[PDB]
Design a protein around this ligand. Structure first.
Ligand code: GTP
Ligand code: GTP
Ligand code: GDP
Ligand code: GDP
Ligand code: MG
Ligand code: MG
Lengths: 429, 437, 429, 437
């Protein structure tokens, strides 16, 4: 029960998800074919949340892979773990979003979304008791920003009670990967604040550091960055898929981490993150995993938490460990950083412990941080937005696809109705 | 299944495609017979090679010229067996450096033959994205017939991503006398039709083939290799699965801020010879600084005399996306590369897993990574200010106008094209300034 | 408990420390890998003071190796006992101090020290109850004089109660190894007198004699000199790491040996020191070890103690011995040298006996001498300083790195506010 | 990771580097192809050899000359395969013993090409310490182009440790006539830029190669071997782990008391032939007295006519640090070696574990230890007093001035360079005296 339908939009969400279903199929002992080949029934105890059992004791991933061009899917369906998905789920268009939000949300998104929701409604009725939908997309792309935020507006109307957690790859502070990514972000944050119960801001600049600084990867490809995003993604729902000494799920992480319904923009974090040689020179203890999370250099959203206050904090742990060793360290980082945590939420640390470690690990963590440090995430984008929009640059690639300037006047004001709220609840006594 | 057909207008456009379709056959293992030995591809060729009933693949190319000689060398060359002979379209007499003969006199004859051959290709395309028009601004065919053709494709399709790869006239190198006439006239027409026209100059490839490749004597064989590496790397994300793909719809979205301004200048790197394939290591930080270096661009413009509006780094091969961010974040800190005030996000990044291959008989070296920068900049306003100045000197004496009036064109139409080009000239002045408050 | 974080600055402090962790890893039976391979649990009883226990029953040295050039560390990390340190601890710059104090304390030191203290604060919080920080550096170099005395000024502000013992290789009287070592010393003694609880003055000229005269080494390399410094360094904390019949530690040696808080500049001494053949022609008795310490030719600081008075004296002994045999000899050298000891400190001999001898020794000593004999150590340097400074020679390699002459007017006066104090408490009735 | 690039200006600087980079390839096992057989190094080569993609290492050297002939012998020599051919920079006409042609006329042409090739090397350096400019004071390129280049590197970098290895003009040996002009002019410019310029003289190596090596006929092949052993032993502490290492930042700190006075004179020992590699034992006490002996220095100056301000003994090989103190403490007691009154600490000592290797075809002997003394002394004021006296005789008649005025230089600029050199001449008189009280 409590099944989760995984939706992938954009080139980015497919490349994360194809690595994400590599982690899930290893945690559950699933072969490349689709059959179970693990050791214990605990992998088969909650196999049903991400898997439908097909005939012949094979399992298909409960995944809906959406694109607007076939270039990403043919890399997915022909690579490793590509013969495990159903061929029905690959719902892709032909024209491509063109790295455009309006082509992803109005023109080519709407000409595919009815063939997507009928695969959603097919998978949603195949669920026993639906927990909610997780989505993996970007905010700089055209499909993942356009088709993704079009899927959320259709789903929240059709499923108002279910949780809608998105794994949005927010654009990077230093470099861009798209000229019009301040436009694709601001038009998506207009659609994320009203229809998602939570949203995990990830930056590619921060994962460039964590591969180089923390893991000592001189040559990190996307296959190395996506194994860090998927380590968070499997680590969020690891207490829903496995027994633990203190089980959490996607509603405990919704209630405990969202004090105000707009302010559901989180930053993740993972621990342990070690190098190849430097993992035998380190004691894997809960006080070691705790202080590895709460520093600046282990935040996957490229912002220092010292510039803001943590509103709420979740620390989902994996592997066998003792609860006092946890609960002291959840207190220990709150005593020394009492100004760094928000004051009017006393004891703002959510704790979750799973009994099953990741494969090849003794114990592991999964940090979820809701801070006012990501007001600078939107101070940067809305400054990059307004510098482009006051010259009306690239406007005709959106106005020609069915959009007015009133769409931008609202979406910029909606983001500055969110920057002023993190400033309100950082200044709150 | 994301098909993309290409049109080749003029003598320049056919000779470019003779190197482009030479390059595409080597990237997919295609023989010049079409019989690729299938003894790893997996529908990689589909965006350009509609398959026949046998084991023969034929290209989605429409080679059009008004004179037969450049088509007949394809018909007798190595790629005789490759191309569908109905696609190889000839006229009888060329437009012959006359825009009005390419647009009114001779071009109206076979325009219904070309639109027929497009529509036969466009019907067997199931996921057709856009067009790749190869032409030049100098010749009468590449200016006149293209501008006639781009009128017709926007009528018939409109929403398709019509891309051009134009041979822009050099500031001091001109192989024709009425290049200031054929370039102003063809841009007045292709402005409201072409989605993103990629400028390429000969003189800036004369610079690169002499300096970067150390060739004393570069031929039009060699200049068309460098343009083929550009168009391959743009369509490398369609044909091959990459770590971060990019469609042709994404280029017009990321690079065109205003529907007038859609003229980026391409730039390829690394351009090094075989002796210099050693002696340097070619990181993605090393090949990225080569693109923003003003000497290595392929339009003779000084980007330090303007501002980049949108850059587009199209990496391919052994490229790691973390070192990409290491390569790009340094360049926004450098003062010589400056952007416009309204654009904080001045990049679109693409990565392919496939390296560029080398054509045998080629002059480039086998490299494990490449980059095709497509940078829309304000520095092209210096190029149009020259070309109106070359227009205004010739037209004030009414030189060569009787070769154009006598072919159906109004004399006052030159006042329409020049004042519209002056209206385009102030647009880069309007965009190139900062914002008040 | 009572853990000690070892810090190494300069080329010299690394070459001492790489030999120092060769002695500690032999006293605790630690392999080149990092694992325990001794015989008794007394090596594992207080293993935790210099070691953190990693996973897999391996021990990493609690050491922070700091340089400004990678030339010293690559000799350390690739030699013997180089695979035992954590790769995180090697915090080195690229530019090099250039044998300059100002480049070590202002320019290239400050551009690295925040990445050093975060390794200090990582190791300091890994300590159970921190005893204090020991530092190994020089006063003639640029890094060890600059980066080292920059680390002490940061630490004493952040840890005001902890002991800060430095092992400063003070420059030699006869030869120099640096043209500007009167400048690097005087600018460091400005920083040592205000932020270190004690400091062990060692001279390379005196160890050149002790290798030649006492041990009969015709060819002593630095690997032979550093085994004599590390024999003192392990001999100071040997009662903190092992049970003894009278245990001392780094606070007993702080309280008993520092009568006035500036006057914490000590000279060490070690016994027994024998040749190869001449060790079987000698009875190893406590009266033999005692008279070997207190002569002029066994002081590692190149000054005769007969030119001054011993203020306080510590004699940390190792190996099994009887306390009357000790306490007679601690009295016996005080009766015959009653003018050589200071008068207004009656019974000025601190005694410590450890039960564990060094490896390959029956018994051993470790002399700590606080004398007015090292007023001539600063009479020589401040004369070498003032001869160079009155011509303002080499001033522009310091003034160009952010320094004025007022820095030298204070640092010279601070040393002559220390020369006059040893003259005050040698003339004291 | 402590990278250090080197520049080679003039005919002298290239021919020095032809022996220096010959020596570095033998110390790291590098073939002239760059393919070192890796069948113990462990990032020893990193300070000079940026690695390529293959198993090929290329040097961090910028060989610049305004005439092609000395570069072309490198391009056709044994080390053709080693050097990156973009680094081998040629002009067309030499400066030709004209400082103004090296600094104004010809040097301004390729100075942006050289600063480009430096900045390509300086970007792939991760821990770049400083520069090794090899030039001569006599020639027009080594004086004019170096002084133009050192103006530009202090603008672009400033804080890097810019070191020079200059061929100082001998008192009675002069292979050019206007060496008293090119040496005064290049020192007026390099004074405020170069951090520590190492003087080397030809005649004092004519003394050593005749006496100490027993060669009747020493060639410029042989004089450049002895300068290569100097620059190897200075950068031996970077490339190899020593018992007491020394960085290039430590040399300018220990040897330069005043920013004007930064002119030490190098001295190498042991310089003995193969027959005399026997018949003596070469302790570190034996090879230290060879350096302070006035006959064995490599600038024709009498150190007994002045005082040492800072000496720098750079030992390498089988060296024991206790016997070092035995070697040095005796020399401060000797009366012939005297220091200045303000300097009690007149030494910087470095020890490397690696012996100097011998080049096959070399004239030095295989020794287990060496020493490169870098002694900043007052005895070089005798050298500048000669060179102003050679300047003042030529300039009073205004000889050769029209070859310099006609190339863009002011005639009054010689009054600027001479009065500044006179201001440098009194500095050694100001420092060489003792202190009152
Ligand atoms: N880059 C490149 N440009 C070419 C090549 N061949 C011709 N051109 C350009 O083509 C321009 C002239 O246009 P053409 O293509 O020769 O003539 P056209 O377009 O067929 O029109 P007509 O004059 O009627 O034949 C010249 O300015 C050349 O710069 C080529 O192989 N490579
Ligand atoms: N030590 C040493 N000095 C050399 C060597 N070759 C030339 N020189 C010196 O170089 C000086 C002349 O300068 P050059 O390098 O020949 O000329 P340049 O610097 O290239 O300037 P131009 O005259 O314009 O060519 C002479 O005084 C020689 O002493 C050499 O191989 N070894
Ligand atoms: N973390 C991560 N981000 C990616 C990856 N591939 C692409 N992206 C990001 O996705 C954005 C482009 O979106 P994309 O999905 O490729 O374009 P779209 O298909 O039109 O939505 C860029 O800003 C990239 O930073 C990946 O493998 N990992
Ligand atoms: N006792 C001892 N002293 C050394 C050793 N190596 C260098 N030194 C001393 O360290 C001083 C040079 O300092 P160094 O650390 O090398 O320079 P820095 O790195 O700039 O601080 C010299 O005065 C040497 O006497 C060694 O192995 N043992
Ligand atoms: Mg033509
Ligand atoms: Mg020359």
């Amino acid at each position: 029960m409590r099944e989760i339908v995984h939706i992938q939009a954009g080139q980015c969400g497919n490349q994360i998800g194809a690595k994400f279903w590599e982690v899930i199929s290893d945690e559950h002992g699933i072969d490349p074919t689709g059959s179970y080949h693990g050791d214990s029934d605990l992998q088969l105890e909650r196999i049903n949340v991400y898997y439908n059992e097909a005939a012949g004791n094979k399992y298909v991933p409960r995944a809906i892979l959406v694109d607007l061009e076939p270039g990403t899917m043919d890399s997915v369906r022909s690579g490793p773990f590509g013969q495990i998905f159903r061929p029905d789920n690959f719902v892709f268009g032909q024209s491509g979003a063109g790295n455009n939000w309006a082509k992803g949300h109005y023109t080519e998104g709407a000409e595919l979304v009815d063939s997507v929701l009928d695969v959603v409604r097919k998978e949603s009725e195949s669920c026993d008791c639906l927990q909610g939908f997780q989505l993996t997309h970007s905010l700089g792309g055209g499909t993942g920003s356009g088709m993704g935020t079009l899927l959320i507006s259709k789903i929240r109307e059709e499923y108002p009670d279910r949780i809608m957690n998105t794994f949005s790859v927010v654009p990077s502070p230093k470099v861009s990967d798209t000229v019009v990514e301040p436009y694709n972000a601001t038009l998506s944050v207009h659609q994320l604040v009203e229809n998602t119960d939570e949203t995990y801001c990830i930056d590619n600049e921060a994962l460039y550091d964590i591969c180089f600084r923390t893991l000592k990867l001189t040559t990190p490809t996307y296959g190395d960055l996506n194994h860090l995003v998927s380590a968070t993604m499997s680590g969020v729902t690891t207490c829903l898929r496995f027994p633990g000494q203190l089980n959490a799920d996607l509603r405990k992480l919704a209630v405990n981490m969202v004090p105000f319904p707009r302010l559901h923009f989180f930053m993740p974090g993972f621990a342990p993150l070690t190098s190849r040689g430097s993992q035998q020179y380190r004691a894997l203890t809960v006080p070691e995993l705790t202080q590895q999370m709460f520093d600046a250099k282990n935040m996957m959203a490229a912002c220092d938490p010292r510039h803001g206050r943590y509103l709420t904090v979740a620390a989902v742990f994996r592997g066998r460990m003792s609860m006092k060793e946890v609960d002291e360290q959840m207190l220990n980082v709150q005593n020394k950083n009492s100004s760094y945590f928000v004051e009017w939420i006393p004891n703002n640390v959510k704790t979750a412990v799973c009994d099953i470690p990741p494969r090849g690990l003794k114990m592991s963590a999964t940090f979820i941080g809701n801070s006012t440090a990501i007001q600078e995430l939107f101070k940067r984008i809305s400054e990059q937005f307004t510098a482009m929009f006051r010259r009306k640059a690239f406007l005709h690639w959106y106005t020609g696809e069915g959009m007015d300037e009133m769409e931008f006047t609202e979406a910029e004001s909606n983001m500055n109705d969110l920057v002023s709220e993190y400033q309100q609840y950082q200044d709150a006594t | 299944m994301r098909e993309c057909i290409s049109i080749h207008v003029g003598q320049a456009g056919v000779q470019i495609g003779n190197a482009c379709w030479e390059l595409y056959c080597l990237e997919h293992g295609i023989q010049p017979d079409g019989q690729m030995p299938s003894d790893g591809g997996d529908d990689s060729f589909n965006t350009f090679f509609s398959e026949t009933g046998a084991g023969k693949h034929v290209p989605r190319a429409v080679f059009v010229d008004l004179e037969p000689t450049v088509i007949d060398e394809v018909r007798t060359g190595t790629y005789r067996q490759l191309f569908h002979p109905e696609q190889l379209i000839t006229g009888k007499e060329d437009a012959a450096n006359n825009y009005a003969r390419g647009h009114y006199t001779i071009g109206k004859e076979i325009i219904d033959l070309v639109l027929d051959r497009i529509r036969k290709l466009a019907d067997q395309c199931t996921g057709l994205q856009g067009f790749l028009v190869f032409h030049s601004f100098g010749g009468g065919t590449g200016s006149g017939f293209t501008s006639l053709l781009m009128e017709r494709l926007s009528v018939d399709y409109g929403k398709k991503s019509k891309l051009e790869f134009s041979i822009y006239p050099a500031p001091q190198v001109s192989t024709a006398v009425v290049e200031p006439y054929n370039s102003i006239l063809t841009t007045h027409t292709t402005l409201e039709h072409s989605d993103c026209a990629f400028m390429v100059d000969n003189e800036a490839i004369y610079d690169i083939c002499r300096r970067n490749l150390d060739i004393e004597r570069p031929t039009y064989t060699n200049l068309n290799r460098l343009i083929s590496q550009i168009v391959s790397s743009i369509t490398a994300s369609l044909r091959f699965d990459g770590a971060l793909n990019v469609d042709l719809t994404e280029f017009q979205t990321n690079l065109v801020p205003y529907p007038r301004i859609h003229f980026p200048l391409a730039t390829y790197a690394p351009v090094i010879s075989a002796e210099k394939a050693y002696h340097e290591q070619l990181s993605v930080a090393e090949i990225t600084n080569a693109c923003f270096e003003p000497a290595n661009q392929m339009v003779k413009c000084d980007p330090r005399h303007g501002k980049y509006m949108a850059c587009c780094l199209l990496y391919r091969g052994d490229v790691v996306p973390k070192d990409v961010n290491a390569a790009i974040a340094t360049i926004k800190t450098k003062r010589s590369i400056q952007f416009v005030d309204w654009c904080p996000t001045g990049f679109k990044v693409g990565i392919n897993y496939q390296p560029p291959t080398v054509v045998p008989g080629g002059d480039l070296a086998k490299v494990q990574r490449a980059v095709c920068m497509l940078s829309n900049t304000t520095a092209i306003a210096e190029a149009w200010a020259r070309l109106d100045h070359k227009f205004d000197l010739m037209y004030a004496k009414r030189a060569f106008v009787h070769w154009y009036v006598g072919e159906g064109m109004e004399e006052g139409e030159f006042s329409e094209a020049r004042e519209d080009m002056a209206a385009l000239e102030k647009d880069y002045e309007e965009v190139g300034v900062d914002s008040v408050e």
